[PDB]
Amino acid sequence: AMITGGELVVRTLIKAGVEHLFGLHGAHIDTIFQACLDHDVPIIDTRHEAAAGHAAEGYARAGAKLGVALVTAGGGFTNAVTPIANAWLDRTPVLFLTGSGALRDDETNTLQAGIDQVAMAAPITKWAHRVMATEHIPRLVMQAIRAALSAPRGPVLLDLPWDILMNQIDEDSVIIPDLVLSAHGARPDPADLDQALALLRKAERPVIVLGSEASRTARKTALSAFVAATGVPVFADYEGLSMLSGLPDAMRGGLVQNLYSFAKADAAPDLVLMLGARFGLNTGHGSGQLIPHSAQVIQVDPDACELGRLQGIALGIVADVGGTIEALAQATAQDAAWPDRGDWCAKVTDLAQERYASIAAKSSSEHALHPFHASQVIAKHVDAGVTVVADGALTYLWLSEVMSRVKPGGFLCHGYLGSMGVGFGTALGAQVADLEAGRRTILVTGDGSVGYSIGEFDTLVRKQLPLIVIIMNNQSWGATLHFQQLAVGPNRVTGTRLENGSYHGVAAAFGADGYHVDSVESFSAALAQALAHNRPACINVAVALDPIPPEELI
Amino acid sequence: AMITGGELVVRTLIKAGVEHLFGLHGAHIDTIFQACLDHDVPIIDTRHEAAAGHAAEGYARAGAKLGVALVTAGGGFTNAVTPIANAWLDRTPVLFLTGSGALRDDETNTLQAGIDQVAMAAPITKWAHRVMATEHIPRLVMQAIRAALSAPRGPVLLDLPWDILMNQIDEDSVIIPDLVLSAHGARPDPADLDQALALLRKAERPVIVLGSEASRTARKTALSAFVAATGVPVFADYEGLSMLSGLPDAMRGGLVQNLYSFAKADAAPDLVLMLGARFGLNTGHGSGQLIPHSAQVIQVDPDACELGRLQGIALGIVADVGGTIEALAQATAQDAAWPDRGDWCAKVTDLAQERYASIAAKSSSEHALHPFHASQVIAKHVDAGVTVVADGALTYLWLSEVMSRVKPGGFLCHGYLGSMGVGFGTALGAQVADLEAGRRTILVTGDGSVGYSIGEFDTLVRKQLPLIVIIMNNQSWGATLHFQQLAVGPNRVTGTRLENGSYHGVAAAFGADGYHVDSVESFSAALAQALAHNRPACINVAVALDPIPPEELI
Amino acid sequence: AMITGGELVVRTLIKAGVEHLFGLHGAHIDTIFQACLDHDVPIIDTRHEAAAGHAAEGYARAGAKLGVALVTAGGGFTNAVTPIANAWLDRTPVLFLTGSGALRDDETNTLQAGIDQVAMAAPITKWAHRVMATEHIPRLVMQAIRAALSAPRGPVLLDLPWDILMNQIDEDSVIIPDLVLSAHGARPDPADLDQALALLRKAERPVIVLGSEASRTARKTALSAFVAATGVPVFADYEGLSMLSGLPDAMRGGLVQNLYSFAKADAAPDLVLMLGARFGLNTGHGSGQLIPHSAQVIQVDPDACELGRLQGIALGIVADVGGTIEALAQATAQDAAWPDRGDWCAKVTDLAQERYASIAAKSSSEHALHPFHASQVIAKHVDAGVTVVADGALTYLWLSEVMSRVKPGGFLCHGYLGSMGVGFGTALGAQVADLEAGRRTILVTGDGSVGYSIGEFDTLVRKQLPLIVIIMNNQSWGATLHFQQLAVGPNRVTGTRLENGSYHGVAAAFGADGYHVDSVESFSAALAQALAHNRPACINVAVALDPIPPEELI
Ligand SMILES: COP(=O)(O)[C@@](O)(c1ccccc1)c1sc(CCOP(=O)(O)OP(=O)(O)O)c(C)[n+]1Cc1cnc(C)nc1N
Ligand SMILES: COP(=O)(O)[C@@](O)(c1ccccc1)c1sc(CCOP(=O)(O)OP(=O)(O)O)c(C)[n+]1Cc1cnc(C)nc1N
Ligand SMILES: COP(=O)(O)[C@@](O)(c1ccccc1)c1sc(CCOP(=O)(O)OP(=O)(O)O)c(C)[n+]1Cc1cnc(C)nc1N
Ligand SMILES: COP(=O)(O)[C@@](O)(c1ccccc1)c1sc(CCOP(=O)(O)OP(=O)(O)O)c(C)[n+]1Cc1cnc(C)nc1N
Ligand SMILES: [Ca+2]
Ligand SMILES: [Ca+2]
Ligand SMILES: [Ca+2]
Known part of the structure; x- marks a missing residue:
């Protein structure tokens, strides 16, 4: 009462x-x-x-x-x-x-x-x-x-x-x-929509970018629909990546970052349909290098502040991303008279591979496991029944390079805050959600990052959550060590070494399985073995430090 | 240039x-x-x-x-x-x-x-x-x-x-x-100073209580002079306890908390002089249980806000506490007509040590190491060469029943935030200050709180800080567990149990010395070995959960 | 109940x-x-x-x-x-x-x-x-x-x-x-105090500056005391000016601004005792031009942030200004062995007059009442039974020039905010306070400023408050018009003319007496007549615009 x-x-x-x-x-x-x-x-x-x-x-x-x-x-x-x-x-x-x-x-x-x-x-x-x-x-x-x-x-x-x-x-x-x-979002005005679709068809080399707002509504079937109908290839920032997971393979551009090359290969888009993707870090700011100054940008965001923040745009629309995609799918169900875009769809897939292969060709595993080879080992276990969380800096930069080439159930990586250590809690909450869906969560983090919440192995055990934590252990705060070296001087490293600590022992002390591994071969068994079990796992992987990922460098 | x-x-x-x-x-x-x-x-x-x-x-x-x-x-x-x-x-x-x-x-x-x-x-x-x-x-x-x-x-x-x-x-x-x-602080007007002394001179059962501004100024010697001249017992809140360590014992009242039974037995102070003691958690808010309603209060704080915040005062002065302590000392050196107060010093000592005796009498260590017994073991090692940091709740509430009887270099406990887990970083910085003066730092924390910052064992080892971490391991968020049992019911615990994890084990995985113990004698040996070495250590002490400290039982 | x-x-x-x-x-x-x-x-x-x-x-x-x-x-x-x-x-x-x-x-x-x-x-x-x-x-x-x-x-x-x-x-x-x-403030430490007094005596050409904190405590008798005893001459920012009102006339430097000349007349102080005066606008920032870089500054302020904010100082003390002056008065009641300072005390008075006379010599009243001559008419009615409030910009700049040479009961002028129009409410509250003390309030404002709260004549009448509002009417937002002209171009005036409106008619419409006047002679009668009555009064005075006060200009 x-x-x-x-x-x-x-x-x-x-x-x-x-x-x-x-x-x-x-x-x-x-x-x-x-x-x-x-x-x-x-x-x-x-x-x-x-x-x-x-x-x-x-x-x-x-x-x-x-x-x-x-x-x-x-x-x-x-x-x-x-x-x-x-x-x-x-x-x-x-x-x-x-x-x-x-x-x-x-x-x-x-x-x-x-x-x-x-x-x-x-x-x-x-x-x-x-x-x-x-x-x-x-x-x-x-x-x-x-x-x-x-x-x-x-x-x-x-x-x-x-x-x-x-x-x-x-x-x-x-x-x-x-x-x-x-739950149905708010859609653009038909005029604004036609206008968008008109610019769409009349243009030669168009792309769709997805932002987080697109993963939050998860209007999946409507995404594929509108994509079949139009044959327009789709890129994504980290948060949008799992939205590409149910696309016909040919039209998946993957991560927006690999749009970078397109200046050199003279294939920069004439049109970008930004859907929830904001101007800024993940979209190359207003610098032109990912989204061309010469391209016609069409941007849909619920925040009018975001519309053209950093770069002149050709049309700015305030709406719900999810509600829009739906509108786009319903409008091109009326159409079926759409241009071909064969050159482009292959010109898309081919360049993403060429960049993948250029890293692939570089990268030697003699006397230190290479961060890209660890990333590949991981990629090989990633399908739609796996959420991957990434933390760590160098770790995630390398990881991102293999990620365009797979179809995860989720991809949760650092946003604008870039805070090292958020991965552990993130992955742990992700796994609760994954349990109800039958998926499985893998956390890929650095040895720096893991130390933020390492106590959480305890929680993993008390609540029996099968998370797999993979620690890219390069015995340092890696991206920051790199910065000191490239930016200031080879002799100028301080406060960035972490040459100590047995993380798999920490995990075992909490009652979880702990692997340490230092070769490609021993890493895959540890991974496969961990995947094979319904237990919390830690896998401490020894990883080369001085290899430089593309997204630093040049 | x-x-x-x-x-x-x-x-x-x-x-x-x-x-x-x-x-x-x-x-x-x-x-x-x-x-x-x-x-x-x-x-x-x-x-x-x-x-x-x-x-x-x-x-x-x-x-x-x-x-x-x-x-x-x-x-x-x-x-x-x-x-x-x-x-x-x-x-x-x-x-x-x-x-x-x-x-x-x-x-x-x-x-x-x-x-x-x-x-x-x-x-x-x-x-x-x-x-x-x-x-x-x-x-x-x-x-x-x-x-x-x-x-x-x-x-x-x-x-x-x-x-x-x-x-x-x-x-x-x-x-x-x-x-x-x-570095000298502002002092009270000589007229205010005299009025306070005037009041101080005519009181039957006077008392001084120190607060944090007394520890930050550290006029130990001025304070002695003034206590010696006037013969008035001194109590302190947590943060001011080390200020009582240069003082003759016949006039150490210990922690403010133990003013509790002075009312509860017809000896409530006549007059209380608060130096930086704020009204609040540590002084019993406005309840008059420690600072009685019937007493005259002179309060000296630098922030007018605090003056008589919760409870009327006789006289409110805003000045620096240290400055004020100096002023008092040097005014008191030169009027030598201060009544004895031997009786009062006695009664104050008897009651402080009555409480302590009484808890001894009722603390049985049969079936599991009683936290009061564990706290006695720590106590036998505490003097001016030791900084004690306290964290964990039940842990510090038991520990604090022993701290009045010892004379530490430092005593860093929870302030109003009450934030479990701050102890580890606190103790680590404390151990840095302490090396400057060759002191040793010990952390006494709960099994819940140490989990917040468990990764600082790595900082201990990489930096060679010999902090000794003592964990009072009662396999729960203890005080909260007691709250559930006492305010809701025996049947009603959830969210408060932590029956998992090997903390010594974790510390060893980070390169620190781990010990596990569960009796008076074994803890006693672990602690003595830890003190004997110049290395960081962790000691995990299995402690009973059941016994309720005096604080709670109000 | x-x-x-x-x-x-x-x-x-x-x-x-x-x-x-x-x-x-x-x-x-x-x-x-x-x-x-x-x-x-x-x-x-x-x-x-x-x-x-x-x-x-x-x-x-x-x-x-x-x-x-x-x-x-x-x-x-x-x-x-x-x-x-x-x-x-x-x-x-x-x-x-x-x-x-x-x-x-x-x-x-x-x-x-x-x-x-x-x-x-x-x-x-x-x-x-x-x-x-x-x-x-x-x-x-x-x-x-x-x-x-x-x-x-x-x-x-x-x-x-x-x-x-x-x-x-x-x-x-x-x-x-x-x-x-x-009510007795907090005083400096005796060491700090002696040190101050030692620097005081051993120096050749010292001044005291007063800030608002000195008017708030109003420790008047203690101010004069300490001033007799030491013969140190006293300046003030606007807010401190009424503190000079009960000083022996010879040692009144008046407004700190007229300390400006002292570089040229090679008589800059070797020592400044800043009491409540802050580094910033009214004290010539950290530029050196009022308070010399070469001088030894002693500064007493309750805010440690203020101490030496903009300029290296020789001693910074946190205390209550009022409590300090008192301390200074009590310390030099023990002394009576103080150096003469005849050169300086006259070298002080003489230079303040020379600046007064230089304005006096300039300033012609042919075809426009000169703002300085209006200011003089006002000054002639100002003794300790009058509070003057100043608002308006040009108006107050001119007014400040006559103000050093009189002893008001109060002086309330713009602080750092510099907000035009606050004068009306200020003067109205001032007059309530003045009623209980037998003083009388005169508000000197611009024609811009008055329009902020002109409706208050109504309040003046309903509550019968004898305020006298004198409007320096130069038919414009004057200082701002000047700025446009001197800074941008003679041809570049916009938005700064106010060539319209009969303010005395507004006042009369509210039931107060309203004078308009446009000569020295008719202004004094209006003023005298207004002073003579126990009624709210408005006096709209026509005043030349293009004369430039010193504090602009050079
Ligand atoms: C360029 O800026 P940087 O300062 O190097 C840094 O912020 C950063 C962020 C994103 C990408 C690259 C570097 C990052 S990179 C970085 C090192 C990460 O070490 P970790 O061992 O996790 O991985 P790895 O680089 O060795 O793979 C640090 C400490 N920081 C700064 C930082 C500090 N503390 C917290 C909570 N978050 C942070 N991001
Ligand atoms: C009355 O409030 P309570 O909720 O009981 C609690 O806040 C508390 C209780 C008594 C004294 C001080 C704090 C405390 S006591 C407490 C248990 C801590 O367990 P720990 O194992 O560290 O020591 P012990 O009590 O078992 O000896 C918790 C979790 N909380 C709430 C809390 C949560 N998270 C953080 C960051 N700080 C907190 N204080
Ligand atoms: C229920 O609240 P009330 O206090 O009665 C009042 O706030 C109000 C009343 C009814 C409707 C709207 C506002 C209103 S009504 C009100 C009277 C305004 O008198 P006015 O002569 O302008 O019109 P009328 O009511 O005589 O026709 C006042 C002074 N107040 C409070 C108030 C004060 N100062 C300012 C800036 N705004 C305010 N609203
Ligand atoms: C140098 O800065 P300026 O912008 O000229 C101005 O702020 C100013 C302030 C102090 C001294 C000199 C000028 C002043 S001077 C000024 C004109 C004042 O006109 P008013 O008729 O009162 O007197 P006078 O100068 O003609 O004697 C204005 C509008 N402003 C800016 C301003 C606007 N609105 C409000 C609420 N307060 C302000 N201070
Ligand atoms: Ca790393
Ligand atoms: Ca506990
Ligand atoms: Ca004007």
Whole structure:
């Protein structure tokens, strides 16, 4: 008859279809834990709030759904800050639920109070707000969710004072609302759409770029449709890559980065259809080198700020990426009178291979396992029933080079924040989502990066999560060591060596399987053996340091 | 002639007198690393920016000096937020230098740019500011330090864009300024001072309570003079305990907490003189349970806000605590007509040691090592040559029932943040300060909290810091587990159990000495062997979970 | 028996000795108005919240006490923002009490809610906070007051939700605390003090500069004392000027600006004792031109950030300015063995006159009343029973030139914000304070500036406040017109002419006396006539535009 505010949170979460939370206990948030027990809603409790926040991200990114993080007042919240800022920059819809000091006893110098968590999250969230009344919990939870899920997706921080959670109200007087928000996005205007399609057909060498917004809606069948109908080849930033996974093979350009060569091979596009991809780091800023100044850019983004940010564009449209692709698929179901593009579709596939082979031809494995050969070993196990998470710097740069040539169930790599160490929690949340889909998660990280959340092997074991963590161990903070050397002087290395530590022993000390390997041959067996088992695994791989990936260098 | 913004920063730090930085590398801040090679200033690099921030804190606290943390753009910053908050609430002077995105290329969606780091830190720093031009560096750095070191001490964040730091200027054109800020603090008006002395002279059961501003000023000798002259017992909060270590024992009350039973037995102080003690968690808020409602209170704080925050006071003075301690000492040297107070000193001692005896009497170690028994073992090794850091909750609440009876060099416990896991980095920075004075550092932490920063074992070994890490392993997030059992029910634990992982094992995988123990005698031998060696160690002590410490039982 | 939160505010205000509020009604704050009615506490209700906020400032500045502003939710608060930011920069202690949306009905899109007033005031206040509980009102009001009153003085924003004000509690259960904070400031350390006094005596040509902090404490008798004893001549920024009013005439340097000449007349000080004066605009930044690079600066400020901000200093001391002067007066009551300084004391007075006379010699009144001659007419009525407020730009620049040569009861002019139009509310609040002291307020403003709050003649009449507003009417935004001309081109005037409007008619339409005058002779009669009456007065004075004051020019 009388229920707690924490029970209100959870009943509302359920109504929204939430099935998993990620967090770390504290008394301020106990009422949420008790309610979960009762509705049998697993809370995956980790060893650091960062890893819990990153888990929520990975789960949202892998499952294309809402991720939910739960942390307690004070240090709970401050340890979640890297996750919030990462999700903000990657545009991932996560609800961060955070405990806080009771409203009574404001300004009392009390335990875990006196920290304005809302004010700190405000610069990095789509919405940050503190609940003032137990009665408000459901409408505010549901409002927070709508803000997170709608285009562009992003993090939200709902702060729940201890007071407000512990307070009990008459359960017959309160209304748990529905989540009532169309999953069908908003589409462009038909004029704008025709105009787009007209520019499309009348042009010679066109590409589609995908951004994160395209993976969040996951309008897969509509993507292939529109692609069959038009024969326009498709590139992607990291986050869009798994969207190419169900394409006819011939028209997969893979990673947008390998669009770089196209100046030299004189085949730069005359038209780019940017769908959710933003001007900036992953798209070569406004420099011209990936997206030509001479090309006609058509850009669809839910944020009008993003439209042509760094470079003159020919048409800017505000809409939902998912809703647009759908519109594009429905419009070319009316058409079937589309130009051929044979030269181009092969001219696309051929150049991506030539770059792959140029790395392939370079790269010798004498006296040090080459980072590209490790990357290849990994690529050989990657199909649509595998999510790959990448962390590490050099590690991920090398990895990206083999990644265009495979069709993963997911690909979760660093966004604009570039924060080393987020991989562990990410992959761990990804694997929760993968479990419900039958996929399997592999984390590829550096020896620097892994040390951020290595304690998570513990969580992997307690909750029996089959993640495979592969550590590219080059005994250093590699990209940064490189920078010191190439930028400052061969003699100028400091603070970037990591010549110590047995990570597989750390993993085994936590109760997971740990392999160390230092040859191609022993790596594949370890990998195959790890894939073969339903256990958490660590694979510490010795890897050459001084090879330089393309994306540094020239 | 030509130097980087990096050298500018470093030259100014030198001029101000800093000997050690704490950090972790990034290209954005590399110019600062280089400038530290040349001037041969060590930068203790960690495995997590959080651990680095905390070390600068431990160093500032253990050595009563400025702590300097150095971190990179984006993730480097967000990982520092917790130490910053932590320093904020404990009033500890730490300069946080952070790199950020270049000012040119502002708003370009570029790597590690794109979060407003000043906006995030503003709610938890004394000052937060972004540098606009290389020529501003030395005045801005010097300003940062002044703000960090003045009363009350706290954290400062100085954001340093990549442009500013890479930019080169002719060394001739910019003057490095001096640290002009006399070290003596402001004192009370002689009329206030007299009124306080006046009150102090006519009280039957007077008491002094010290707080953190007393440890940052460290007027040990002035304090002796004044305690010796007036014969008034001294208590302290966690942060002020080492200030009681130069004092005759007949007038050490120990920790404030043990004022509890003075009311609970008809001996409540007449008059309490708070020096930097704030009203709040550590002084029993406004409850009057430690600082009684009936007593007259003279409060001396540098922040008017704190004066009588929760509870009326007789007299509120805003001044530096150290300055005030000096003033008091030297006013007290010259009026030698101070009543005896021998009785009162006795009653105060009897009650402190009654509590202690009483807990001894009821602590049985049959069936598992009792945490009070474990805390006694640590206690038998503590004096002025040892810094004790405390983390973990139940762990520090039991530990703290023994700390009154010993006289440590340092005692670094949780402030208001209450953030589990900050201990490891704190202790690491503390052990750096301690080497300057040949002291030894010991960390006493829970099995939950050590998991936050378990990877600092690697920093211990690569850096040859002989920190001894003691884990009180009760296989749970203990205090939270007790909360579930006591506030909800026996049947109602979830999320609080951690029955997995070999912590000694982890530490060994990183090259540190691991020991496992589970009795008085075995722990006693492990600790003695750990002390005998100059190597980092980890000791994992199986400790009972059931016994409730006095704190809780309120 | 049951009383409102609004009654709690007022009972607390009374206990603090508050006797006047300034504001503008709204229903959200009605409970505060009703309580005022009952305790007979005048609320001076104005025509714009800006003018009410500025009134609170002027009253605090003129009375050396707390000013209290009261404004309602939403636009009430946003119209107070210029006042808050002005008070922040001038360091004036004002409590801004603001209404806001009820806590219930947060996020309801309701009337005057949905505006985070705390977040907007946070960058410009010493403390901004929202009350969460009716029971908290007294301790929070009293805490807000202590933050405002203590060094450095500044604005505070206490936000009071409608809910919280309207809620009624048991009046027998709540404690109205006292304001318990020493009025005696904190003094320097004796070593630091002797050192200062030693540098003082051993130097040849020393000056004292005063800043606003010196007028806020108003330790007058202690100022003269220390000045007799030492014979050191005293300068002041605008805010410190009234502090020179009770000095032996021979040692009054007046406005710090006329220290400018001292390079040329080769008489730059060898020592400057900066007391509350900050490095920056009013003190010639760090350029050397007022305070010599070659001089030994001794600076006392409560803000360690301010100490040597822009220029190398010889000694930096953190303390209360008022408490220091007192310390200086008590230390030289022990001395009476002080060097003569005859050359200098005359070399001081003589150069200030020479600059006065150089303007005097220039300046012809043929076909336009000269701005300096108007300034002189005003100066001739200024003694210690007159507060002068200055607004306007050119107007105040000219005025400042006659101001060194008179002894006002107050002098309130623009601080760093330099906001045109704040004069009207300022002078109006000043006059409330002047009424209780028998003084009389004269506002000297431009024709631009007056138009900001001209509606206030209405308030002047409703509350019968004898202010005299003198409008230097030069039919333009004068300093800005000058800038366009001198900086850009004679032909390049736009947007800076104001060739229209009869201000004395506006005043008369509001029921006040209005003079227009266009000669020296007719101006003095109008002034004398206005002084002679106990009525609000407007005096529109036609004034030449193209004369250029020194402080522009060269
Ligand atoms: C060019 O900028 P850089 O400063 O070198 C760096 O930020 C970076 C980021 C992306 C790509 C390349 C380098 C990266 S690269 C880097 C070394 C990574 O070491 P790791 O062992 O994980 O992998 P590898 O390079 O050896 O494969 C570091 C420490 N940082 C800076 C950094 C520090 N702390 C945190 C939380 N995040 C960061 N990104
Ligand atoms: C009353 O609040 P509680 O929730 O019980 C807790 O916040 C606490 C309890 C008593 C004293 C101080 C803190 C503490 S106690 C606590 C258990 C820590 O377990 P650990 O194994 O380290 O030591 P012990 O208690 O077993 O000896 C946790 C997880 N929490 C909440 C919490 C979570 N995450 C972080 C970063 N900091 C925290 N304080
Ligand atoms: C319920 O709130 P109320 O306090 O009654 C008030 O806020 C209001 C009332 C009804 C509708 C809209 C606003 C309004 S109504 C109101 C009276 C305005 O008087 P006016 O002479 O302009 O028109 P009328 O009501 O006499 O026709 C005031 C002063 N206030 C509060 C207020 C103060 N300062 C500023 C800048 N904006 C405000 N809204
Ligand atoms: C050098 O900067 P300037 O831009 O000229 C200006 O800010 C200024 C301030 C102080 C001294 C001199 C000029 C001043 S001077 C100025 C003209 C003032 O006209 P007014 O009629 O009051 O007096 P006078 O100069 O004619 O005697 C203006 C509009 N402004 C800019 C301004 C605009 N709006 C507000 C609220 N405050 C301001 N200070
Ligand atoms: Ca590495
Ligand atoms: Ca534990
Ligand atoms: Ca004018």
